[PDB]
Amino acid sequence: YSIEADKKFKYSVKLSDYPTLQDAASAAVDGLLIDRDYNFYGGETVDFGGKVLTIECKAKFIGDGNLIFTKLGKGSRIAGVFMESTTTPWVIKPWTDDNQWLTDAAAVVATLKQSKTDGYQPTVSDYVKFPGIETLLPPNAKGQNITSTLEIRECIGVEVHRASGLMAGFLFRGCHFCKMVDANNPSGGKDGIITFENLSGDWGKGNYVIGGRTSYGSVSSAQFLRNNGGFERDGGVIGFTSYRAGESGVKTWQGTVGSTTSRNYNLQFRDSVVIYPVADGFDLGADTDRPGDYPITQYPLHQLPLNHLIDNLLVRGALGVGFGMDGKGMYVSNITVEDCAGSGAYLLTHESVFTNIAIIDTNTKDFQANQIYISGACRVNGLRLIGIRSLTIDAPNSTVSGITGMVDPSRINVANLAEEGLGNIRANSFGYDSAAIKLRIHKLSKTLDSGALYSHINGGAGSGSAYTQLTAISGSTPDAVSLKVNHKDCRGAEIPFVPDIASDDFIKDSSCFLPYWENNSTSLKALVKKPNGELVRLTLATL
Amino acid sequence: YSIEADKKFKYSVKLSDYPTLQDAASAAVDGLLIDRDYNFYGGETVDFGGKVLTIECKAKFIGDGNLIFTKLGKGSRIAGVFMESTTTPWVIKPWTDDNQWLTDAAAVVATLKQSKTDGYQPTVSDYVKFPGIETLLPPNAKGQNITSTLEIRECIGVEVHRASGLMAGFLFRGCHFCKMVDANNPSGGKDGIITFENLSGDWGKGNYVIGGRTSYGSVSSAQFLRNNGGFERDGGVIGFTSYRAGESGVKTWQGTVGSTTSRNYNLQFRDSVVIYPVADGFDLGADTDRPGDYPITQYPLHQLPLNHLIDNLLVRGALGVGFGMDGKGMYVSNITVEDCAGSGAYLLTHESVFTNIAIIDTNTKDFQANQIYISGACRVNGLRLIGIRSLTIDAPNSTVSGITGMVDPSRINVANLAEEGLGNIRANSFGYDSAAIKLRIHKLSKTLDSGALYSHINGGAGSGSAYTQLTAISGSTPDAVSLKVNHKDCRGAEIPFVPDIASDDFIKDSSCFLPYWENNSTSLKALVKKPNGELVRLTLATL
Amino acid sequence: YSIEADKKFKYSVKLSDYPTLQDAASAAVDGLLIDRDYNFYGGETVDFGGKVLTIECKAKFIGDGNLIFTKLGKGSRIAGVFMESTTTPWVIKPWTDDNQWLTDAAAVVATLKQSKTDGYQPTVSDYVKFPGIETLLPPNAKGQNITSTLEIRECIGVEVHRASGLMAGFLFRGCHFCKMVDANNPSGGKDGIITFENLSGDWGKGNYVIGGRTSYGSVSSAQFLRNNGGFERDGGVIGFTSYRAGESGVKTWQGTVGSTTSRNYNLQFRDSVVIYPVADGFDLGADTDRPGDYPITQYPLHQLPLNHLIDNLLVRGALGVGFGMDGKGMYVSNITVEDCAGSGAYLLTHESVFTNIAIIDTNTKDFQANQIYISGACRVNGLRLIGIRSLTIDAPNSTVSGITGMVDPSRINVANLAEEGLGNIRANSFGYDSAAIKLRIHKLSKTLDSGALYSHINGGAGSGSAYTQLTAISGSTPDAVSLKVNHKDCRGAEIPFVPDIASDDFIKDSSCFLPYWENNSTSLKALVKKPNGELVRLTLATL
């Protein structure tokens, strides 16, 4: 029988048969079932002998600190892992029962409670976020560092599916071709919930976060350090949801970490949602003299050729910036940012193109100077601004086209704004006695329209009559001077004349005449510039 | 050997070794394989003893009625379950071989056949949908109620993957943190194909429909009752496809069901597609005096703070409404609705913002009064209307900006329409001898333009000459009065004058003159309003 | 014990216990583990006896040619299969270290190396792509045909999950309801990486590519032949990523293949990305007299009722066309195409509607005549053109609305262009001393504006003064003739007069007068068309 049984049954060892996880790991052949809770000590390391194992979790890994899995064969998969700390730390919950953000330090300190979820352990960044909280926080709620972390170390081709936990953390250190798939809403701890760190060895490649969601955590939900997906863009965050990150939803590190670069290149950030981050929705910047990376002489600050593939992202409820990034020659598209306390978009980009961006009701708490900021020479094609609620857009060097929304024109600052390819046009006016087409030269004034083409009703609704008027501003009074056609259904043109003797320099073109008033004789004269260019004054109208 | 075998093999019991499913359930430890068809009786209940089991299905569960699974441990998963009724009921197929909807009751009754798919069992809602069908339907095709339903009862953390079936139904009753993942196109029965019902106990939370598709069914494909995902938006429908729902593709219930509220809050409806529903694509309304919910005094009808996260939805071929909803303070974005028989969007929303909405060829069968309806004070930023095919939009209290499409201006009714932030403009005219910029004051007339700025060719193409004309409507005749510049390349301005003695009240502003005709002397006079405001009549032109 | 063990353990056979795969297949009951590398010979066929098996791969299938799996029961799934050729062929890598495409044949031939990845085996299509490469390529780099292919033959309900490999290929021949799920980035060989071929038997249905990615390959990544998903749109490519396809990312075949039609109907192509294809991103055409398909008399060339559900696609870096297709009555939406060497969109469609299309920086290498081409009578609603970089759009028979971007108006050719539903308008000018609203009649000239309404600053910034001017082109000189209001803050209207005796035909409407010059008397006369229609010449201004 044994011979037969050995060839007809599925191999699998279970943790309940062993005293330690390593013993179970040493016995494992094909499968390994975690069928009983296992308390680990920080630093507990498990060597899997390069075996391609299928680890199925039906119990928890309990402990503060890291549980290190090493030497897993390419193709190994862990499903259902639940990480839980042994400590229940002090957490703050900076939002009300109506889901209103609390920005007052005393108000936030008042939210203190011991819990493994529904809030996060304060960090130094909070000292900056809620001014004066550092002096208000009790010593026991400061400097905490609780996180039950599963650390996968220097492995290739390992995938973690449907992971979960309380005060949980997932760290891939020195890994390649690993994926965090369908994270089953783990509640974060002190460190990043999902981190791909490659500060040593080769730049991380093939590392992804695919689907799923996370909640809470003191810092960022998903984060990468020194990863480069290459031209193939092998790596990134796709179809992921982050909720209430103590810092940002998705973050690519900036500057020098340790003695090398923590920057990232050629990654994908697509089809993802980030809601209510205490900081930013997406922090995709690289710079904050670049050991391990491009020198400043080659690429100036904020001008690295990051080349991330960025598309179809949604951000809502950020206490900070909805979408932030830097870099040169970037192509960004289909970004929707709604209801943010600080800037919806803070762009330190140069020679980049943004297509179909929607920034709806951001900088609601005046944290920044604008709803959207772009520093370098960029191109924006399609920009929807204003929802139902300081400049709106400040992109001094960018060329914009296609803005939609109830924007205040005096709150727009760009290098150039133009609609070169519209067809025949119709201005449809609703709720008013007139329709209008206004012209505003921002060099003359950002607050006053310089001219206009109106159409006003003559009489009342259904009169079948209106008068058209062409105007010009004078003395900073918009519409001061104007020509009308059909005022009071009279069917004639009302023409404005110089109230006094017209000076020679008033007339501009030849073969034109400019009517002017001669009060001393109750006459209307006409300064005429003959087709030959000569000036002559003629009597136009008299008694 | 036994000792060894016990520790080296994967545990799993199979249904072929047991007489009843409960016996197999009682023996199960880790896995459970359904390797033979099992005929169940309606109400057959299986108790899983709180075990975290992995149920793998390779056969069918055959029976009309419900197969109840209870006490499954958190973390249990069922994969490949196939539900099939024993009865082959009478189904109608209200669409032609060219995929044309049949709206004639006699035509639909003619489609009757006995089948477990490719149509659905008629319900009372069909009596309303196809007028007079109630009296045409034969008694045996009426009041049917066939559905082979897998009911998961009061469980937490249970997931059903790749489920399928014929006349199938999946009901999660009193469940939390359960998911319907990658539904492998089950063909629906009488009840909802996927239902998350929490009328008892706590409001459902953590319940999702992730990916997959369903086909047919008498009512809605995916539906929720009394679920609240909280601020974290823990729950919803993401990446799902519904085809030919007898009622709606995705539905959140409204009003009182039983003695409590069936309404839903804080759910996600994203990245989904609904094609050919007999009713609506997405029915996300809450109201149709609210036991178990907010009182009408707190929140008026259709003004509940639903707070669903709604983004990136597509609807095509609905016989009803493509996208419907109500609520207050909602943010909706990236919705595309094409080819619908009734309203593309029916919005009973107040103080809500809609961003980037595309309603293409809807209300093709004049079922409603408009293509898109919005009742309350809302904001629309980006609205694409008209494809290749009664008002188009009726949003009496909403402010709109950025409409694109070959819309008929007289079919637009809104509170305000404006393009405040456009840059320098160019009207490009193709296929015509002129380009135009028209002004229409809807208060004066919704069908006639009140004024215009044109450019017309002088001579023919390539003449290098055109004349500009500013016009005004009079006597309900558009362009009745006008001023021209360069008519017939003459290089002069043609000016309109009052055909008779101009009345004092005709002139509007000081320092202006209005030419008028004096027929009795073949003279052109001029009513002049001096810079001081006084009126004087002067002789302008004479023989 | 045996009795007990037989009922409590999970069944599974492993390849290491058998000499051939068929032996293992014959012994398999529930599971089958590929735990050792298996070298197969081309054509090696495995019969699975109609068993519903779960094949788990932890090793490779090594061989050039096809490994044929037949008679797998409905519900079978293969996970982790790794295909690898035994031959390391010669591959070209037509892109530089800066990810620049090489278009020079000598430059591309210089990239030759023997490798199983990072390039592809040249095919005849390359002879066309890189002109003269055919004569430059060494005989050993020509006519290669290396591909380690897993062929699933005539099966139903079989799914392949997380497949991978080197010079790998996956062929579903005569299959239905099969899916290629989460392809784990296999590197392609000579043939298509994922092919659903149904040239025999019924049209393929229920066949999908769901998620995942592929890299390289000589031809197309995902491709279908003679598949029809029906009205239910049961089949397609959803959430897939293709990188560097030797031909196209996603392709539906055209014309007659063998003796029948290779065309496809009713499929879905949604939520997918195609980057750097040597040819096209998406080739969704059907035509290139249609055996097995609709006759040309019924549907003319390029006018088949394809009915694919196409939405949310992204294409970047194509050396060819970003998005191509043909067909009649199609609805296409949310397509974003960036940085392509040839046309971003080549549309041989008729009576179709395109909604929200963004073509950003395409035809960068002038491979085509335009960035976007549409042949038939189509409708485009929302078109974003030009990024940061020959006509831009050539759609002679289409009606367009809502173009955004810094487009050159002379590079637009359409049947009609109009913005019928805009509200009140404001032209905001930045960086200039004037704002403008220009009119261009393309029939008169595609390069010169025929008229304009300007607003120019009087003096300098902050003067609070500007002058409005209405102009008209004459002698092919734009703005030749104009009327001004407030030039030099004079507050009067400067009016242009005919430089000579105005001819009778110059005046257009009755009750109007046209000033003209009478040089022989230094007088200004006026040609007047009385309200009765009669002409009279009056003296207007004199000395």
Coordinates of N, CA and C in Angstrom, one line a residue, chain B residues 95 99 118 185-186 193 213-217 221 240-246 249 273-277, chain C residues 230-233:
Chain B
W95 N -35.9 39.7 -27.8 CA -35.0 40.3 -28.7 C -34.9 39.5 -30.0
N99 N -30.6 41.0 -32.8 CA -30.4 41.7 -31.6 C -31.2 43.0 -31.5
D118 N -31.1 31.4 -22.3 CA -31.5 32.1 -23.5 C -32.9 32.7 -23.4
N185 N -19.9 33.3 -15.6 CA -21.1 33.4 -16.4 C -22.3 32.6 -16.1
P186 N -22.7 32.5 -14.9 CA -23.9 31.7 -14.6 C -25.1 32.3 -15.3
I193 N -29.2 37.0 -9.4 CA -28.1 36.1 -9.6 C -27.1 36.1 -8.4
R213 N -18.8 37.6 -14.8 CA -20.0 38.0 -15.5 C -21.1 37.0 -15.3
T214 N -22.3 37.5 -15.6 CA -23.5 36.7 -15.4 C -24.3 37.0 -16.7
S215 N -25.3 36.1 -17.0 CA -26.2 36.3 -18.1 C -27.6 36.0 -17.7
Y216 N -28.6 36.6 -18.4 CA -30.0 36.4 -18.2 C -30.5 36.6 -16.7
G217 N -31.5 35.8 -16.3 CA -32.1 36.0 -15.0 C -33.3 36.9 -15.1
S221 N -28.9 41.3 -11.7 CA -27.7 40.5 -11.7 C -27.0 40.5 -10.3
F240 N -17.1 44.0 -12.9 CA -18.1 43.0 -13.2 C -18.8 43.3 -14.5
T241 N -19.3 42.2 -15.2 CA -20.0 42.4 -16.4 C -21.4 41.7 -16.3
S242 N -22.5 42.4 -16.6 CA -23.8 41.8 -16.6 C -24.4 41.8 -18.0
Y243 N -24.9 40.7 -18.4 CA -25.6 40.7 -19.7 C -27.0 40.2 -19.6
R244 N -27.9 41.0 -20.3 CA -29.3 40.7 -20.4 C -30.1 40.4 -19.1
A245 N -29.9 41.3 -18.2 CA -30.6 41.1 -16.9 C -32.1 41.4 -17.1
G246 N -33.0 40.5 -16.6 CA -34.4 40.6 -16.8 C -34.9 42.0 -16.2
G249 N -28.8 45.6 -14.2 CA -27.4 45.0 -14.1 C -26.9 45.0 -12.6
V273 N -19.3 46.9 -16.5 CA -20.0 47.0 -17.7 C -21.4 46.3 -17.6
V274 N -22.4 46.9 -18.1 CA -23.8 46.4 -18.1 C -24.3 46.5 -19.5
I275 N -24.6 45.4 -20.2 CA -25.1 45.4 -21.5 C -26.4 44.7 -21.7
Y276 N -27.3 45.3 -22.5 CA -28.7 44.8 -22.7 C -29.6 44.5 -21.6
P277 N -29.7 45.3 -20.5 CA -30.6 44.9 -19.5 C -32.0 45.3 -19.9
Chain C
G230 N -21.2 36.2 -29.9 CA -22.7 36.4 -29.8 C -23.1 37.7 -29.3
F231 N -24.4 38.0 -29.1 CA -24.9 39.2 -28.6 C -24.4 39.5 -27.2
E232 N -24.2 38.4 -26.4 CA -23.7 38.4 -25.1 C -22.2 38.8 -25.0
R233 N -21.6 39.0 -26.2 CA -20.2 39.4 -26.2 C -19.3 38.5 -25.3

